[PDB]
Amino acid sequence: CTGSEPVDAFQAFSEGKEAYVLVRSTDPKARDCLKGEPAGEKQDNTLPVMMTFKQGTDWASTDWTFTLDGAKVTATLGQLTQNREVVYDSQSHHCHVDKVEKEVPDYEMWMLDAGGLEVEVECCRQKLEELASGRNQMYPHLKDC
Ligand SMILES: CCCCCC[C@@H](O)C/C=C\CCCCCCCC(=O)O
């Protein structure tokens, strides 16, 4: 299950050309149907992204600025900041696993919303299990999305 190495966030995001959906999270507060979609070309070391999600039955969308530094991703919206590091990226950049850096860290698995490359998907799941062993996983994309 060796993936893409060394890990690079821009590469993990298919060079800002694709949308990714959150499929596994250890965070009980993870947004239902969370998806990230590029909203413009890379500008310097940043990438504009729209994050879409569903709250109850209502769809919502927020505008974030991603600052990339190797495998590190700093996402900002107004006074809000979320820090992550991409810790595993599949061979073809089809899925990846993040560590969400904060007091009690959380882990996430994101993937292209397209089908295929099941072996790479299984590898991401295995890697998430290793990084987050013993943590309960929730499934944000299995929320009638
Ligand atoms: C670029 C296309 C999307 C890629 C997604 C990358 C994935 O590694 C996650 C990286 C940053 C996630 C930022 C989450 C911001 C919270 C959004 C929901 C909200 O408004 O609370």
Author numbering: 24 to 168
What does the paper say about this structure?
We have recently characterised OmCI, a 16 kDa protein derived from the soft-tick Ornithodoros moubata that specifically binds C component C5 in solution, prevents cleavage of C5a from C5, and thus inhibits formation of the MAC. OmCI belongs to a family of about 20 tick lipocalins that sequester mediators of inflammation from the host plasma. OmCI is the first parasite molecule described that specifically targets C5, a member of the C3/C4/C5 protein family that orchestrate the assembly of the terminal C multiprotein complexes.
We present here the atomic structure of OmCI, determined by X-ray diffraction at 1.9 Å resolution; the OmCI construct studied here is the double mutant N78Q/N102Q that allowed expression in Pichia methanolica and is termed pOmCI. GC-MS after extraction from a pOmCI sample and esterification identified the methyl ester of ricinoleic acid ((R)-12-hydroxy-cis-9-octadecenoic acid), C18H34O3, as the major product (47%); minor components were identified as tetraethyleneglycol diethylether (21%), palmitic acid methyl ester (21%), and stearic acid methyl ester (11%). The most likely origin of the ricinoleic acid bound to pOmCI in the crystals is the medium used for expression of the recombinant protein, as a sample of native OmCI purified from tick salivary gland extract did not show any ricinoleic acid, nor significant amounts of other ligands when analysed by GC-MS (data not shown). In the pOmCI crystals, the carboxylic moiety of ricinoleic acid faces the solvent at the opening of the β-barrel, where it forms a hydrogen bond with T85, and interacts with the positively charged head of R54. The rest of the molecule fits snugly into the L-shaped pocket, with a kink at position 12, where the hydroxyl group is hydrogen bonded to H119 and D121. The C9 = C10 double bond stacks against the guanidinium head of R107. These interactions, together with other hydrophobic protein–ligand contacts with the side-chains of residues F36, L57, G59, V72, M74, F76, W87, F89 and W133, account for a contact area of about 280 Å2 (as computed with the program CCP4-areaimol). Given the good complementarity between ricinoleic acid and the central pocket, it is likely that any physiological ligand(s) of OmCI will be lipid or lipid derivatives bearing some similarity to ricinoleic acid (e.g. a negatively charged head group, an unsaturation at C9 = C10 and a hydrogen bond donor at position 12).
